Amino acid sequence: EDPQLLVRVRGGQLRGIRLKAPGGPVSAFLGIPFAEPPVGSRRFMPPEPKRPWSGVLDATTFQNVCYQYVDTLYPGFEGTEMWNPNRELSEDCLYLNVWTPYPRPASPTPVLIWIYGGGFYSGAASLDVYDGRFLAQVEGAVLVSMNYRVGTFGFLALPGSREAPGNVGLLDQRLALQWVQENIAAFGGDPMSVTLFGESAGAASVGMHILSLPSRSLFHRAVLQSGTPNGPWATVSAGEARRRATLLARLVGCPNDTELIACLRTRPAQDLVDHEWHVLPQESIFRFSFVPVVDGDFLSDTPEALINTGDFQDLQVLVGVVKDEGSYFLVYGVPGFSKDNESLISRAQFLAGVRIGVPQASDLAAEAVVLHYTDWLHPEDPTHLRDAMSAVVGDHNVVCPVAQLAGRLAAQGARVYAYIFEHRASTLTWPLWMGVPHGYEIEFIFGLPLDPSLNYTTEERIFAQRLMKYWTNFARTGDPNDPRDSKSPQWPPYTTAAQQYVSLNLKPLEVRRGLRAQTCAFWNRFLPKLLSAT
Amino acid sequence: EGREDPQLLVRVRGGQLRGIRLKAPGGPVSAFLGIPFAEPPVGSRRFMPPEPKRPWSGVLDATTFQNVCYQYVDTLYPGFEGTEMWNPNRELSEDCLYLNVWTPYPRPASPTPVLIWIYGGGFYSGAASLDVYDGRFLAQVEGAVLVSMNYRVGTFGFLALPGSREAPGNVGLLDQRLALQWVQENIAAFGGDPMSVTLFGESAGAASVGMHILSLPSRSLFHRAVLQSGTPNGPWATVSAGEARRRATLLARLVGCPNDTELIACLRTRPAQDLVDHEWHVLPQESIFRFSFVPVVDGDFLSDTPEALINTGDFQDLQVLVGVVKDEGSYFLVYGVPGFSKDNESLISRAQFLAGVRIGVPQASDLAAEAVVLHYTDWLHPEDPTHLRDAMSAVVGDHNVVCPVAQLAGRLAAQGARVYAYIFEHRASTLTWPLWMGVPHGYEIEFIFGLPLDPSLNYTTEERIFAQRLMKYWTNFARTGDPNDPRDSKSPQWPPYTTAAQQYVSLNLKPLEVRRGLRAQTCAFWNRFLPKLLSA
Ligand SMILES: *[C@@H]1O[C@H](COC2O[C@@H](C)[C@@H](O)[C@@H](O)[C@@H]2O)[C@@H](O)[C@H](O)[C@H]1NC(C)=O
Ligand SMILES: *[C@@H]1O[C@H](CO)[C@@H](O)[C@H](O)[C@H]1NC(C)=O
Ligand SMILES: *[C@@H]1O[C@H](CO)[C@@H](O)[C@H](O)[C@H]1NC(C)=O
């Protein structure tokens, strides 16, 4: 037995597996339980710490994916399948994964904790794009990723109830964070240097740990990729959570909160998922049924209120967006859009897409969006209209929420670094019109281009090495700039005054100013004033 | 007769006239100045439509400009050429309905296209006798017959109690119409062609031209139109019948006049200066680019709002030239926006910007005003004093001129008209206004009229050549309905403005450059978005 692969944690002993990375071996400890299986009476309930076990636990394999909706829009297509569960679905899914250098670090190493996205309705830490072996091997990092409950199982709330209090998926993440504090030193990780990073709902999740005080003692730095806790999709009110929970229950024949939740707990998992999408208040895209709730507990106030009034003095944050945040979502609901054609649309279809794409928008607000995003020199041009549709969805849901967060954090004392990611992977299977879609920076940050069997260009490999360095420098120091390297040029902090951010592409860093400043002023300053009066 | 110049004696329908031979740089021109076209609108005729001038006996002396219509005289910067150039240069009188004709010397043997100038000044000021409106250069260099008329302004031209017989409103426009009828009957005596008449005007003059396009009785009196930095549509060129009535009766109160017959009769007893002294007191809000007595939508001269009439009109056998200067708003900022002056750089604070926007968009709600502020703010430099100053200028110019012109051009083009559009971007070397104002409202006119040709005025040689270019464009358009030269085609062409391609030309010292979209995005804000906000 290899002593590098044998670790004692508080719960007992584990056996990991030596994996081959391109440059050398790594130690992986996969499928480690951090909670009691949240099954039977424990459904919808906060997670409990895993009971200690006897002997040596086999941690050589990824554990089950949390029970979730699986996308079926394009069967057998790698662009969609790469996000689908790659292990069996189960409610028993509260396990985490650790990658370390082989041999394990001689001195305490900065820890990166990955929180996947998927709209709080999907995702898994076992996906090939979240493979931590490259960062471990090349950068010497200790990388951790956890499964958290998604959908009804993670976020169905009857606020104020003891049995479905809400945000339990977020508590799953917090428990994995606690597990790292208590146990990561055994693997050579430094619990006094923990960086959370995540994409999409994962970045929103990272954001919620920033805004929830009990999470704050469990990490030191944060990275939010293409997602925020503020914004239109990441939270609901307690009233809207209750309403959706009560409707889902009706839809499955259930049944006083106690009685309603008891009947929901009797239902086969797939029975809940069958009706998951039927509880949304309007026809929409970029809207998810069961998400974090403003409960007055995990989240003391709305994230908007919390970012406006928080003190973020001793925090460093890396945030950013991809060049084409909205394109990917268009094919999941807006008529005229499809991966299989160029998606050239009419004005009529633009107007209709805006109502679906900004579902809470009133008639007047929807007219303001159309009038702002129309190119009045080319008002009927299908290429313009299609690209504007993408812009509306990406700006409303990601870019402007991100600018808003960056600015508040910066004003309230945080050290902030911002990027836009603009390289389209040579291997991308989505069509050209989608540009650099949501999610397609991740494979570069994780260093997948360094596996020569994946057929990335040598440029893409060098670029991936640049990104791995920015991320791990940031984890190490709270500054993504290389401290032993001179020229570059340097990545400046994002500030409310200068509003500097950098482009991440195959060219050297270029510094730009103003992250869609005019358009986000429309979204962040004008539209709120509109509908709070009308 | 006997000893006088035989080219200076002409008979019109009312009698015999004697003109004057004037010197232009390239040679002599004939001028017939101060020809009366109406009975003096005095006493019981105050506020009343003009009646045609009754024939006179003997030879009327038409050798000097006549009285300027009674008006408010700008007093903000006394001694200063920049303002005095617009001020009255003849005696102020209610007896002011006279017109001017310049023609070549000797008068042309075959009938020549006629240009009729209508001055601006917010419908409260102006005269055809001002030096910037001197027709001699066009007459001499282009062989043009040029006509300009005085029309009543202020209360005298536009005070209305709509529905009344004694103060029906729009009579200043009726003065202009009567001057157009005079040209039809009489211009052939000077060698002018009454079947080729082009109206042109600036500011309120341009608005007036647009209103002659929209008023059917005017349509037989002219064939083509040029609107410079003004339009009949937009926030200032007209008022509703209710607003006219409201202002007329407030004015009456302020001058001691308490049934419309009795009110108007009391107003007719008041000294002219008493009316001028309270003219500005009747505006509903603190404002710039708003004028108390302007054309009224009376359901007669204007059968509907200009907005309605341009959206539904048939303009098929109409050619129109329209444009703007680079900095329409700047001039207006010093007549009411706190923080602004010709004698400093007018760098303003954000607070002054927000305050200025309420004054510059006086009919805007709180929400609309904040939409404006949010649109014009540069969110990279929300507090830069230079950007704020320039944004204030842009707000005022776009709202009042540039976007109404874009709206006008689009409707005209979509409904059959041949439209040619420009932006004029040359700053006169002789301009006395400060540099921050850029190319202000009013400062294309001296070039169209060819003042730079007078070497005593000290324009550069390049400006002389540029004036000659503009004069060709305007007279080519007058001749043919196309500003382009028939022969010369190596030069770059001025393509028509269309809704599809939205093309217009830069007018500056360089050859014509074609550009697309007149402030397309920002005018979508003013012309499409704001009115939808106004609906609730
Ligand atoms: C510029 O002037 C504005 C208008 O007030 C005056 O004009 C200046 C030139 C002086 O002659 C003063 O005596 C006048 O009252 C001011 O309101 C504005 O603040 C000025 N800008 C600055 C900062 O100088
Ligand atoms: C693209 O394809 C989809 C479905 O195959 C269809 O709904 C859409 O109308 C198509 N659009 C174009 C550009 O023809
Ligand atoms: C034009 O220039 C001359 C010669 O220097 C000067 O004396 C005269 O005053 C100037 N005239 C004007 C109109 O400013």
Side-chain angles (χ1 to χ4, degrees), chain A residues 364 367-368 371-372 374-378 497-499 513-514 517-518 521 525-526 529-530 534, chain B residues 367 370-371 374-375 377-381 500-502 516-517 520-521 524 528-529 532-533 536:
Chain A
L364 179 58
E367 195 65 31
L371 294 195
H372 178 90
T374 296
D375 187 310
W376 288 104
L377 285 149
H378 309 106
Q499 303 180 48
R513 296 172 64 167
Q518 295 304 114
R525 295 166 209 260
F526 181 66
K529 279 197 267 204
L530 181 45
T534 326
Chain B
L367 186 53
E370 258 308 312
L374 291 169
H375 182 87
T377 297
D378 181 335
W379 291 101
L380 266 175
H381 303 111
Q502 304 179 56
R516 293 188 50 191
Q521 283 312 112
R528 297 159 189 276
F529 179 69
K532 267 162 180 294
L533 192 51

Coordinates of all heavy atoms in Angstrom, one line a residue, chain A residues 364 367-368 371-372 374-378 497-499 513-514 517-518 521 525-526 529-530 534, chain B residues 367 370-371 374-375 377-381 500-502 516-517 520-521 524 528-529 532-533 536:
Chain A
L364 N -43.6 48.8 -20.5 CA -42.8 50.0 -20.7 C -41.3 49.7 -20.6 O -40.5 50.1 -21.4 CB -43.2 51.1 -19.8 CG -42.5 52.4 -19.8 CD1 -42.5 53.1 -21.1 CD2 -43.1 53.3 -18.7
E367 N -40.1 47.9 -23.5 CA -39.9 48.8 -24.6 C -38.6 49.6 -24.5 O -37.9 49.8 -25.4 CB -41.1 49.8 -24.8 CG -41.1 50.5 -26.1 CD -41.4 49.6 -27.3 OE1 -42.1 48.6 -27.2 OE2 -40.8 49.9 -28.4
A368 N -38.2 49.9 -23.2 CA -37.0 50.6 -23.0 C -35.8 49.7 -23.4 O -34.8 50.2 -24.0 CB -36.9 51.1 -21.5
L371 N -35.6 49.6 -27.2 CA -35.2 50.8 -27.8 C -33.7 51.1 -27.5 O -33.0 51.6 -28.3 CB -36.0 52.0 -27.3 CG -37.5 52.0 -27.8 CD1 -38.2 53.4 -27.5 CD2 -37.7 51.6 -29.2
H372 N -33.2 50.6 -26.4 CA -31.7 50.7 -26.0 C -30.8 49.8 -26.8 O -29.8 50.2 -27.3 CB -31.5 50.4 -24.5 CG -30.1 50.5 -24.1 ND1 -29.5 51.6 -23.6 CD2 -29.2 49.5 -24.0 CE1 -28.3 51.4 -23.3 NE2 -28.0 50.1 -23.5
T374 N -31.7 48.1 -29.8 CA -31.8 48.3 -31.2 C -30.7 49.2 -31.7 O -30.3 50.2 -31.2 CB -33.1 49.0 -31.6 OG1 -34.2 48.1 -31.2 CG2 -33.2 49.3 -33.1
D375 N -30.0 48.7 -32.8 CA -29.1 49.6 -33.6 C -30.0 50.3 -34.6 O -30.4 49.8 -35.6 CB -28.0 48.7 -34.2 CG -26.9 49.6 -34.9 OD1 -27.3 50.5 -35.7 OD2 -25.8 49.3 -34.6
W376 N -30.2 51.6 -34.3 CA -31.2 52.4 -35.1 C -30.7 52.7 -36.6 O -31.5 53.2 -37.3 CB -31.7 53.6 -34.4 CG -32.6 53.1 -33.3 CD1 -32.3 53.1 -31.9 CD2 -33.9 52.6 -33.4 NE1 -33.3 52.6 -31.2 CE2 -34.3 52.3 -32.1 CE3 -34.7 52.4 -34.5 CZ2 -35.6 51.7 -31.9 CZ3 -36.0 51.8 -34.3 CH2 -36.4 51.5 -33.0
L377 N -29.4 52.4 -36.9 CA -29.0 52.4 -38.3 C -29.3 51.0 -39.0 O -29.5 51.0 -40.2 CB -27.5 52.6 -38.3 CG -27.0 54.0 -38.0 CD1 -25.7 54.1 -37.4 CD2 -27.1 54.8 -39.4
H378 N -29.4 50.0 -38.2 CA -29.7 48.6 -38.8 C -30.8 47.9 -37.9 O -30.6 46.8 -37.5 CB -28.4 47.8 -38.7 CG -27.2 48.4 -39.3 ND1 -26.2 48.9 -38.6 CD2 -26.9 48.7 -40.6 CE1 -25.3 49.5 -39.4 NE2 -25.7 49.3 -40.7
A497 N -13.6 54.7 -9.3 CA -13.0 55.7 -10.1 C -12.6 55.3 -11.5 O -13.2 55.6 -12.5 CB -11.8 56.4 -9.4
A498 N -11.5 54.5 -11.6 CA -10.9 54.1 -12.9 C -11.6 52.9 -13.6 O -11.5 52.8 -14.8 CB -9.4 53.8 -12.6
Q499 N -12.3 52.1 -12.8 CA -13.1 51.0 -13.4 C -12.3 50.1 -14.3 O -12.8 49.5 -15.3 CB -14.3 51.5 -14.1 CG -15.2 52.3 -13.2 CD -16.5 52.8 -13.9 OE1 -17.2 52.0 -14.5 NE2 -16.8 54.0 -13.7
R513 N -11.2 50.1 -19.5 CA -11.9 50.8 -18.5 C -13.4 50.9 -18.7 O -13.8 51.2 -19.8 CB -11.4 52.2 -18.3 CG -10.0 52.3 -17.9 CD -9.4 53.7 -17.9 NE -10.1 54.6 -17.0 CZ -9.6 55.8 -16.6 NH1 -8.5 56.3 -17.1 NH2 -10.3 56.5 -15.7
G514 N -14.2 50.5 -17.7 CA -15.7 50.6 -17.8 C -16.3 49.3 -18.3 O -16.2 49.1 -19.5
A517 N -20.3 50.4 -19.2 CA -20.7 51.4 -18.2 C -22.0 52.0 -18.5 O -22.8 52.1 -17.6 CB -19.6 52.4 -18.1
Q518 N -22.2 52.4 -19.8 CA -23.5 53.1 -20.2 C -24.7 52.1 -20.1 O -25.7 52.5 -19.6 CB -23.4 53.7 -21.6 CG -22.3 54.8 -21.7 CD -22.6 55.9 -20.7 OE1 -21.7 56.2 -19.9 NE2 -23.7 56.6 -20.9
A521 N -25.5 51.2 -16.5 CA -26.2 52.3 -15.9 C -27.7 52.2 -16.2 O -28.6 52.6 -15.4 CB -25.6 53.6 -16.3
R525 N -29.2 51.6 -12.8 CA -29.8 52.9 -12.2 C -31.1 53.2 -12.8 O -32.0 53.7 -12.1 CB -28.8 54.0 -12.5 CG -27.5 53.9 -11.7 CD -26.4 54.8 -12.3 NE -25.1 54.3 -12.1 CZ -24.2 54.6 -11.1 NH1 -24.5 55.6 -10.2 NH2 -23.0 54.0 -11.0
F526 N -31.3 53.1 -14.1 CA -32.5 53.5 -14.7 C -33.7 52.6 -14.5 O -34.8 53.0 -14.0 CB -32.5 53.8 -16.2 CG -33.8 54.3 -16.8 CD1 -34.3 55.5 -16.4 CD2 -34.5 53.5 -17.6 CE1 -35.5 55.9 -16.9 CE2 -35.8 53.9 -18.1 CZ -36.2 55.1 -17.8
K529 N -35.4 52.6 -11.1 CA -36.2 53.8 -11.0 C -37.5 53.8 -11.8 O -38.5 54.4 -11.4 CB -35.4 55.1 -11.4 CG -34.5 55.6 -10.3 CD -34.0 57.0 -10.6 CE -32.7 57.1 -11.3 NZ -32.0 58.4 -11.1
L530 N -37.5 53.0 -12.9 CA -38.7 52.9 -13.7 C -39.8 52.2 -13.0 O -40.8 52.8 -12.7 CB -38.4 52.2 -15.1 CG -39.5 52.1 -16.1 CD1 -40.3 53.4 -16.2 CD2 -39.0 51.6 -17.4
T534 N -43.2 53.8 -12.2 CA -43.9 53.3 -13.4 C -44.6 54.5 -14.2 O -45.5 54.3 -14.9 CB -44.8 52.1 -13.2 OG1 -44.3 51.3 -12.2 CG2 -45.0 51.3 -14.5
Chain B
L367 N -39.0 61.6 -13.5 CA -38.5 60.3 -14.1 C -37.8 60.6 -15.5 O -36.8 60.0 -15.8 CB -39.7 59.4 -14.3 CG -39.3 57.9 -14.8 CD1 -38.2 57.3 -13.9 CD2 -40.6 57.1 -14.8
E370 N -34.5 62.3 -15.1 CA -33.5 61.3 -14.7 C -33.1 60.4 -15.8 O -31.9 60.0 -15.9 CB -33.9 60.5 -13.4 CG -33.2 61.1 -12.1 CD -31.6 61.2 -12.2 OE1 -30.9 60.2 -12.7 OE2 -31.1 62.3 -11.8
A371 N -34.0 60.0 -16.7 CA -33.6 59.3 -17.9 C -32.6 60.1 -18.8 O -31.6 59.5 -19.2 CB -34.9 59.0 -18.7
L374 N -29.2 60.1 -17.0 CA -28.6 58.8 -17.0 C -28.1 58.5 -18.4 O -27.0 57.9 -18.6 CB -29.5 57.8 -16.5 CG -29.8 57.8 -15.0 CD1 -31.0 56.9 -14.6 CD2 -28.6 57.5 -14.2
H375 N -28.8 59.0 -19.4 CA -28.4 58.9 -20.8 C -27.1 59.7 -21.2 O -26.3 59.3 -21.9 CB -29.5 59.2 -21.8 CG -29.2 59.0 -23.2 ND1 -29.3 57.8 -23.9 CD2 -28.7 59.9 -24.2 CE1 -28.9 57.9 -25.1 NE2 -28.6 59.2 -25.3
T377 N -25.0 61.2 -19.0 CA -23.8 61.0 -18.2 C -22.8 60.1 -18.8 O -23.3 59.0 -19.4 CB -24.2 60.5 -16.8 OG1 -25.0 61.5 -16.1 CG2 -23.0 60.2 -15.9
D378 N -21.6 60.4 -18.8 CA -20.5 59.5 -19.1 C -20.1 58.8 -17.8 O -19.5 59.4 -16.9 CB -19.2 60.3 -19.6 CG -18.1 59.4 -19.9 OD1 -18.0 58.2 -19.4 OD2 -17.2 59.8 -20.7
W379 N -20.5 57.5 -17.7 CA -20.4 56.8 -16.4 C -19.0 56.4 -16.1 O -18.7 55.9 -15.0 CB -21.4 55.6 -16.3 CG -22.8 56.2 -16.2 CD1 -23.7 56.3 -17.2 CD2 -23.4 56.8 -15.1 NE1 -24.9 56.8 -16.8 CE2 -24.7 57.2 -15.4 CE3 -22.9 57.0 -13.8 CZ2 -25.5 57.8 -14.6 CZ3 -23.8 57.6 -12.9 CH2 -25.1 58.0 -13.3
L380 N -18.0 56.6 -17.0 CA -16.6 56.5 -16.6 C -16.1 57.8 -15.9 O -15.2 57.7 -15.1 CB -15.7 56.3 -17.9 CG -15.3 54.9 -18.2 CD1 -14.6 54.9 -19.5 CD2 -14.5 54.2 -17.1
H381 N -16.7 58.9 -16.2 CA -16.3 60.2 -15.7 C -17.6 61.0 -15.3 O -17.8 62.1 -15.8 CB -15.5 61.0 -16.7 CG -14.3 60.3 -17.2 ND1 -14.1 59.8 -18.5 CD2 -13.1 59.9 -16.5 CE1 -13.0 59.2 -18.6 NE2 -12.3 59.3 -17.5
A500 N -33.8 54.2 -45.0 CA -32.9 53.0 -45.2 C -31.5 53.3 -44.8 O -30.9 52.6 -44.0 CB -33.1 52.4 -46.6
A501 N -30.9 54.3 -45.5 CA -29.5 54.6 -45.4 C -29.1 55.8 -44.5 O -28.0 55.9 -44.0 CB -28.8 54.7 -46.8
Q502 N -30.1 56.7 -44.3 CA -29.9 57.8 -43.3 C -28.6 58.6 -43.6 O -28.0 59.1 -42.6 CB -29.9 57.2 -41.9 CG -31.2 56.4 -41.5 CD -31.1 55.9 -40.1 OE1 -31.0 56.7 -39.1 NE2 -31.3 54.6 -39.9
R516 N -23.6 58.4 -41.9 CA -24.8 57.7 -41.8 C -25.4 57.9 -40.4 O -24.7 57.7 -39.4 CB -24.7 56.2 -42.1 CG -24.3 55.9 -43.6 CD -24.3 54.4 -43.9 NE -25.6 53.8 -43.5 CZ -25.8 52.5 -43.4 NH1 -24.8 51.6 -43.8 NH2 -27.0 52.0 -43.0
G517 N -26.7 58.2 -40.3 CA -27.4 58.3 -39.1 C -27.2 59.6 -38.3 O -26.1 59.8 -37.8
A520 N -28.4 58.8 -34.4 CA -29.4 57.7 -34.4 C -29.8 57.2 -33.0 O -31.0 57.2 -32.7 CB -28.9 56.6 -35.3
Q521 N -28.8 56.8 -32.2 CA -29.2 56.2 -30.9 C -29.8 57.2 -29.9 O -30.8 56.8 -29.3 CB -27.9 55.6 -30.2 CG -27.5 54.3 -30.7 CD -28.6 53.2 -30.9 OE1 -28.9 52.8 -32.0 NE2 -29.2 52.8 -29.8
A524 N -33.4 58.2 -31.0 CA -34.3 57.1 -30.6 C -34.8 57.4 -29.2 O -36.0 57.2 -28.9 CB -33.6 55.8 -30.7
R528 N -38.5 58.2 -29.8 CA -39.2 57.0 -29.6 C -39.5 56.6 -28.1 O -40.6 56.3 -27.7 CB -38.5 55.8 -30.2 CG -38.4 55.9 -31.7 CD -37.3 55.0 -32.3 NE -37.1 55.3 -33.7 CZ -37.8 54.8 -34.7 NH1 -38.8 53.9 -34.5 NH2 -37.5 55.1 -36.0
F529 N -38.4 56.7 -27.3 CA -38.6 56.4 -25.9 C -39.4 57.4 -25.0 O -40.4 57.0 -24.4 CB -37.3 56.0 -25.1 CG -37.5 55.6 -23.7 CD1 -38.2 54.5 -23.4 CD2 -37.2 56.5 -22.7 CE1 -38.5 54.2 -22.1 CE2 -37.5 56.2 -21.3 CZ -38.1 55.0 -21.0
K532 N -43.2 57.6 -25.1 CA -43.8 56.4 -24.6 C -43.8 56.4 -23.0 O -44.7 55.9 -22.4 CB -43.1 55.1 -25.1 CG -43.8 54.5 -26.3 CD -43.0 53.6 -27.1 CE -43.7 53.0 -28.3 NZ -44.9 52.2 -27.9
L533 N -42.8 57.1 -22.4 CA -42.8 57.3 -21.0 C -44.0 58.3 -20.7 O -44.7 58.1 -19.8 CB -41.5 57.9 -20.6 CG -41.1 58.1 -19.1 CD1 -41.3 56.7 -18.4 CD2 -39.7 58.5 -19.0
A536 N -48.3 57.7 -19.5 CA -48.2 57.1 -18.1 C -46.8 57.2 -17.6 O -46.4 58.2 -17.0 CB -48.7 55.7 -18.1

